Ligand binder design. Structure first.
Ligand SMILES: OC[C@H]1O[C@H](O[C@H]2O[C@H](CO)[C@@H](O)[C@H](O)[C@H]2O)[C@H](O)[C@@H](O)[C@@H]1O
Ligand SMILES: OC[C@H]1O[C@H](O[C@H]2O[C@H](CO)[C@@H](O)[C@H](O)[C@H]2O)[C@H](O)[C@@H](O)[C@@H]1O
Ligand code: MG
Ligand code: MG
Ligand code: MG
Ligand code: MG
Ligand code: MG
Ligand code: MG
Ligand code: MG
Ligand code: MG
Ligand code: MG
Ligand code: MG
Ligand code: MG
Ligand code: MG
Ligand code: MG
Ligand code: MG
Ligand code: MG
Ligand code: MG
Ligand code: MG
Ligand code: MG
Lengths: 454, 459
């Protein structure tokens, strides 16, 4: 009786996919490629997939209008909404919204309707449907489901940050209020971090004059709807972690301590500042036997900011080597999860210094697989820092001096200090499994639902 | 405050041989400010007690200039206060690419601690032969001063009044740890902290709650309790100084009256500062005009040069020039003009002539022009006002309140303002003047005194 939906499914012929497997339910997601459109058309029952975890799932892909989907993905969600929720605008010079934003918003409504139709069509014969709506791209869905199913439990879980009210307000009026209107009819809105729940509540208080927020209870009362905000942290999926280095890396790292920065090709991952911080720390000859690997996993390169970030990182690494000597810093840029885990295991120092991050799962996974008791530098603005920051070197991701000094201190630490820190850090990470988080969703929603309906 | 001597301090005294200057005039008290130059130091040495200065408003004040170490000051001014600190509180960083703080930021903090001890020392020396001093400390360069005054004058009323925004907690947190905490430690010992807008007070309380684990905030009482100090946050709006708006009819700058002659005139006016948002103003104008529709309309971008040595400000001027060049290329030659000077007679004259006034700041501590301009305007000009100006909390309901980042919204507001008839414009402008008129400098000074006295009484 549980229905699960999220936009992104990268199929070839994922946390939401693992959750589908845990609950043994179908997963409604978007067809993006032509192959998905064909597979979906040819397979009305859904497409079956085995995940690495060994879980096997059924995925129902929605065939959107291709132009609507193109605009929504490339412009609205991955670019505009991304910069709105992940703090990428300077205000002085960007953004400047024109007609494109309005057409994007209309297209967004159409995409939203596609998901609501799929979810309602699929649940139509269900007497007591439970709706789990995942991701920021589906923020419009709860209002549509609520209109048809006034009594259904609806969780909206957002995997990315929620920005401060002043920053949320950057968006065009129809969009900044329209998104909030779409979300509040949910029974429960979930984020990974208290800071995001707080920012959400402030955004609502600021923009919606009829809303009453309660900061202590973390609730909104708005036009009938009572909505509860919950923080439900996620760390890792053990079954997905249950590898070998990329080519050249083991021999290149052989006689050295290895610093690893790892993340998507997304500006929030902050590899440019990580490299510049390493350079400050290595500035001759502050460090001698150390190399740095920048592991990048290509993702949404249809966004200009993402392409431009890659170039900025490449430029920084070349400048690093020009300074520190040839082959001090390398980039390895592929989407092999096996390579990522291998890099995690080999690291002497792990850097997850994001400008901001909804959670950051790498900061749980990496210490859990690392067999060198690697120290971890973690940005204070990652959702993960609310659970793990006391066990890592928590840093301001904009301060190169602070980061360089953390790098230097981490590499100076002996194996006995590193052993003890790493043990505490693993102990803190270990409870935050995918299975526990799924349970947290259902438990939170069940509790809130009784009050929501009342 | 019977029996009290009041002391007023602020950094900026652009004296060549200002709101704080007018306040010194209102209260008949000396103004302690920074010697920027060699001339300033000489004048201050020659006149230990102070230099007499007539303001154009007609008031006469005594100004006492503090000699700083020349290098300390140039760095505090050029890098810290004109540039780094400005971007922090006026929202000029994208986070993805800027800022990246290096060793210069830590040295800058150290220099800032010096400039701060300079002011606190001078203030305390000046008040040393006073039994019951009252300290009015103005604007963001002096954020460190209240802690030092409190340390040496535990029972003195201290107001710190910040003229610029206070940013959201997440944004304030961009700053290096020593600075983001250090500045809060500096401010909280004040009896009262004032801002021009409620939003700034709210953001300040959030920053304190976020960074200072020892502090307790009350969002409704607007208070902080931290390590002993109870601090009250107050919103004290300021609009205009009537003594700068009376007197003879001002004259327009060279050629403007001719050029604007047969046309409706859109005026954007402001300092050469990215927050003033002229580039978007011009692009919104172009969207509203093209192609036909605003045929008898011209646009004047009045810029007042200030801090052009800051790269962000130089870049802004370049972007505006570029947008004006592109506007003219599109709409026809000489449709949009830039006119730059710091002539206040020219500014008032342009306010007077405007058919449409645009004050569309990306953010603004208050913006006083949005009060002055409707008060002197002779044409019932409409006002487009950014919702992110502190002024909008008082005047937003009486103007066309816009999201300053939305070109479509702004173009539609330009079109709607110019489509309005004389009776609608007359009625709107009368309500707008009525809403603006009470917010005088004199009333704001009284608000400072009244708030401080009340908060001090709650010792
Ligand atoms: O499509 C947006 C991103 O979704 C994922 O990342 C978000 O959700 C993660 C947990 O599922 C968080 O750790 C992270 O902070 C969020 O950005 C996905 O991992 C990314 O590849 C996507 O860009
Ligand atoms: O030195 C910073 C600026 O100070 C003034 O502007 C601030 O204070 C004004 C009121 O005194 C507000 O209207 C404005 O929003 C603030 O930015 C001064 O007018 C500016 O020239 C200075 O750059
Ligand atoms: Mg997307
Ligand atoms: Mg992007
Ligand atoms: Mg808001
Ligand atoms: Mg609600
Ligand atoms: Mg990543
Ligand atoms: Mg991304
Ligand atoms: Mg991105
Ligand atoms: Mg950098
Ligand atoms: Mg930290
Ligand atoms: Mg001077
Ligand atoms: Mg200054
Ligand atoms: Mg500052
Ligand atoms: Mg400051
Ligand atoms: Mg510091
Ligand atoms: Mg504290
Ligand atoms: Mg006056
Ligand atoms: Mg006169
Ligand atoms: Mg008090």
């Amino acid at each position: 009786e549980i229905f699960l939906a999220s936009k992104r499914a990268a199929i070839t012929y994922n946390v939401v996919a693992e959750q589908a497997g845990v609950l043994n339910i179908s997963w409604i997601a978007s067809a993006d490629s032509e192959d998905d459109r064909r597979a979906s058309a040819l397979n009305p029952d859904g497409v079956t997939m085995e995940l690495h975890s060994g879980r096997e799932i059924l995925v129902r892909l929605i065939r959107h209008d291709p132009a609507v989907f193109r605009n929504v993905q490339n412009f609205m969600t991955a670019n505009l909404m991304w910069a709105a929720n992940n703090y990428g605008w300077d205000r002085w010079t960007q953004p400047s919204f024109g007609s494109d934003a309005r057409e994007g918003w209309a297209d967004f409504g159409r995409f939203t309707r596609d998901f609501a139709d799929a979810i309602l069509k699929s649940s139509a014969q269900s007497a007591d449907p439970v709706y789990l709506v995942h991701d920021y791209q589906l923020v419009g869905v709860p209002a549509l489901l609520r209109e048809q199913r006034p009594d259904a439990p609806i969780l909206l879980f957002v995997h990315i940050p929620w920005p401060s009210a002043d920053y949320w307000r950057i968006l065009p009026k129809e969009i900044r209020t329209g998104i909030l209107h779409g979300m509040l009819p949910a029974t429960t809105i979930g984020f990974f971090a208290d800071r995001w729940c707080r920012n959400f509540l402030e955004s609502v208080a600021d923009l919606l004059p009829d809303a009453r927020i309660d900061r202590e209870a973390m609730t909104v009362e708005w036009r009938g709807h009572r909505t509860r905000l919950r923080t439900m942290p996620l760390g890792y999926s053990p079954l997905t972690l249950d590898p070998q280095l990329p080519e050249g890396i083991e021999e290149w790292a052989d006689g050295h301590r290895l610093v690893v920065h790892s993340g998507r090709t997304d500006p929030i991952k902050n590899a440019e500042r990580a490299v510049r911080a390493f350079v400050l720390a290595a500035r001759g000859g502050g460090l001698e036997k150390t190399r740095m690997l920048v592991r990048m996993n290509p993702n949404r390169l249809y966004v200009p900011a993402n392409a431009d970030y890659v170039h900025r990182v490449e430029t920084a690494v070349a400048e690093a080597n020009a300074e520190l000597g040839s082959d001090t810093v390398r980039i390895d840029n592929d989407n092999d999860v096996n390579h990522t885990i291998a890099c995690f295991r080999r690291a002497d120092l792990l850097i997850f210094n994001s400008t901001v991050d909804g959670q950051n799962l790498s900061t749980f996974e990496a210490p859990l697989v690392n067999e060198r008791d690697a120290d971890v530098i973690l940005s204070e603005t990652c959702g993960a820092a609310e659970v793990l920051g006391e066990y890592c070197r928590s840093v301001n991701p904009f301060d190169l001096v602070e980061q360089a000094e953390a790098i230097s201190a981490a590499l100076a630490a002996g194996p006995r200090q590193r052993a003890e820190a790493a043990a505490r850090r693993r102990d803190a990470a270990r409870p935050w499994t995918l299975e526990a988080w799924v349970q947290a969703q259902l438990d939170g929603l069940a509790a809130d639902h009784a009050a929501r309906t009342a």
